[PDB]
Ligand SMILES: *[C@@H]1O[C@H](CO)[C@@H](O[C@@H]2O[C@H](CO)[C@@H](O[C@@H]3O[C@H](CO[C@H]4O[C@H](CO)[C@@H](O)[C@H](O[C@H]5O[C@H](CO)[C@@H](O)[C@H](O)[C@@H]5O[C@H]5O[C@H](CO)[C@@H](O)[C@H](O)[C@@H]5O)[C@@H]4O)[C@@H](O)[C@H](O[C@H]4O[C@H](CO)[C@@H](O)[C@H](O)[C@@H]4O[C@H]4O[C@H](CO)[C@@H](O)[C@H](O)[C@@H]4O)[C@@H]3O)[C@H](O)[C@H]2NC(C)=O)[C@H](O)[C@H]1NC(C)=O
Ligand SMILES: O=C(N[C@@H]1COC2(C1)CN(C(=O)OCc1cc(Cl)cc(Cl)c1)C2)c1ccc2nn[nH]c2c1
Ligand SMILES: [Ca+2]
Ligand SMILES: [Ca+2]
Ligand code: NA
Ligand code: NA
């Protein structure tokens with residue numbers, strides 16, 4: 072119940088929301104069906120439209136008009152945005168030369184440059200170039216301020232997951248808005264775009280920017296706008312708020328446009344009908360900037376122009392139907408479209424079985440346009456598993472396609488020609504970022520970055536401490552002229568042991584064998600040198616990784632590689648080695664095929680054993696430093712140390728052996744040498760964070776050797792590839808991956824073919840940031856370089872995407 076009989080007189084677009092049942096006059100009252108009886112009359116005036124004309128200049132003020140052109144309007148803060156242009160001979164902002172904003176030029180009483188976020192739904196990154204001729208205001212923001220060629224959204228590339236990630240710095244699995252539609256089994260409640268459940272605060276986790284600001288004494292404009300409030304009135308409302316007295320005036324504002332998404336769904340991303348929505352968005356930017364110029368705020372405010380996601384061509388005919396795969400299609404509930412999520416239709420059905428649904432959906436049709444995953448097996452870069460609102464079965468849908476349960480869902484719900492939601496590395500899904508103002512840099516292009524990083528920067532622009540989030544604070548310092556955040560590197564928590572030779576061969580009873588008992592002061596001194604770290608500068612290029620939790624581990628040196636060996640997990644946490652352009656690949660010699668060698672530096676009690684592998688009929692082993700890339704026949708023996716062994720399913724060994732035997736040398740040839748750090752990851756609770764010992768669900772049978780859920784590698788070289796990776800004077804270049812350690816290759820439909828036809832495709836799908844590996848391992852990389860720490864933070868957030876230009 073709302074008592075709509077109160078009045079909006081002097082309350083139009085009030086910032087503080089009044090509680091039930093008193094009627095509202097805020098920018099969201101329409102959405103709650105709660106506005107006072109006279110809200111339209113008083114607050115949504117439209118008389119005489121939105122632009123001053125010559126005959127209106129100096130008019131007698133008529134309070135009925137949508138905006139004003141009377142002499143008093145600047146002091147009232149309610150002129151039409153073109154008032155000074157029409158009536159006072161001023162230029163449009165877009166027609167002025169751009170001139171660097173070296174310091175804020177703000178009116179007296181301004182404590183800080185305000186921030187205005189101008190968000191555009193469905194604005195695909197390539198519109199910035201492809202539509203530039205019809206968007207002169209946006210093109211001036213872009214060219215004169217700071218811009219990226221694109222900004223990467225979060226998955227799924229849907230509206231509310233992205234907007235709320237922009238507002239919070241959090242992945243959707245952490246803020247809880249994991250789709251535009253959701254079921255929460257704990258609440259037993261459903262979130263939909265239509266209706267009231269979506270306003271309940273229990274959906275919305277983390278701390279959005281307007282709450283962060285308010286708690287720290289910085290006032291905020293309200294971020295959401297009811298759909299019926301026209302854009303011209305939104306801009307005029309912002310400009311009016313900006314004319315409030317100092318103590319009442321907000322410092323952060325948001326404008327939202329439902330375009331170009333609205334038309335992109337109807338006409339496709341490049342439909343000829345798309346030009347007009349781009350022109351109309353540009354005209355709105357023009358109104359805001361002209362309005363700021365009138366207020367003498369155009370060299371005071373920071374403006375961010377940012378989208379939520381892009382738009383792909385998708386039509387009704389490119390739909391896969393689960394009814395062509397599943398016998399039991401009526402026993403499942405599907406959340407459909409550009410991603411699929413499956414759960415049981417009834418929790419009382421004991422015939423429901425996820426394993427049989429997955430198998431029925433796996434590589435069943437030659438050109439199949441979606442792939443099923445248990446959520447924990449999704450690429451870790453999507454960070455899309457750790458929330459009870461994310462169903463266990465996920466379908467990753469190919470770009471340009473939909474999935475649906477039955478054909479009748481698609482015609483009894485072609486209309487649409489565009490959609491979004493796909494994998495956030497897909498080029499069509501990328502969106503836009505421009506920052507313009509005194510705090511942003513002038514005429515500066517920055518590399519693409521992820522939208523999870525923006526919250527921290529918005530906090531920096533407002534002098535706020537960000538709530539805990541998934542950005543890496545400092546990684547976007549290069550966007551900013553001032554207000555940079557200068558983090559310190561985390562402190563190392565565990566220091567390593569450096570063991571020398573402490574055990575005789577006969578103390579070991581590991582069930583291992585090696586044909587190495589075939590045997591010089593010219594060469595004995597040299598091998599002792601290698602075991603003390605004489606080659607370490609070659610193989611450990613950026614310092615040893617820091618271990619940021621409490622544990623017991625040893626540094627182990629060798630001719631060709633260095634490692635951090637965990638006494639708790641019985642294997643390395645990391646193994647580091649450099650492969651030059653000139654390196655040669657060799658075979659594992661016949662006499663050494665099954666060779667494993669006790670490491671006389673590490674106790675039998677803290678070693679793996681070969682008997683456990685012999686007895687575990689499902690599990691084999693591989694090596695982290697590859698024997699194929701040994702520097703000499705004699706150095707090759709080090710590669711067979713029991714301290715370089717890790718557990719690997721035979722199916723996974725196909726992937727790993729091809730990476731090590733073929734791809735590392737290919738990368739060194741292409742990049743002029745590479746430094747590789749490889750290791751295990753344990754994330755059995757799929758939270759994206761390093762497991763403790765007591766979270767491990769699987770061991771090599773009969774033993775205490777834990778089985779990794781994934782194996783990672785970080786592959787670094789010189790950005791200037793004219794310099795070899797081990798003699799690089801300047802910035803670095805990195806690519807990394809986190810491969811799932813699975814007992815089959817069912818994810819790769821072509822895995823019966825030679826590894827040359829499918830392995831690298833798998834690796835690309837599981838591309839990762841170094842920061843993703845940091846979270847998963849509790850390690851901190853690149854501690855000793857010649858680079859600034861913020862530059863290193865940017866490097867650690869880099870994702871190599873393998874998408875075309
Ligand atoms: C991305 O960045 C974010 C933000 O930094 C990272 O997420 C943080 O990660 C922490 C570890 O997973 C987590 O810390 C836990 O906090 C618990 C208290 O949580 C509440 O309070 C906070 C602070 O206000 C609040 O933000 C929380 O909000 C979450 O939960 C509500 C639902 O109630 C959601 O609306 C909201 O969206 C958010 O959900 C997300 O996080 C939760 C986990 O909290 C997930 O379950 C969701 O699926 C979703 O992802 C909460 O309201 C605290 O209770 C925990 O402490 C337990 O564990 C420690 C182990 O050290 C132990 O000392 C304690 O005793 C305790 O154990 C006891 O409980 C266990 C489970 O019940 C039980 O097994 C034991 O036997 C014990 O009884 C823990 O400290 C922190 O909350 C989140 N924050 C957010 C916002 O998500 C995220 O990790 C980053 N991601 C990556 C990949 O880097
Ligand atoms: O636009 C859609 N839905 C409605 C219309 O407007 C909304 C919900 C109100 N809100 C708002 O004013 O946003 C301000 C803001 C800025 C930041 Cl930077 C951060 C935040 Cl959190 C909010 C967005 C929609 C729905 C379904 C779809 N399916 N496909 N495409 C779809 C689009
Ligand atoms: Ca959207
Ligand atoms: Ca974990
Ligand atoms: Na075995
Ligand atoms: Na396969």
Ligand SMILES: [Zn+2]
Pocket residue numbers: 193230332333336491
């Ligand atoms: Zn949309």
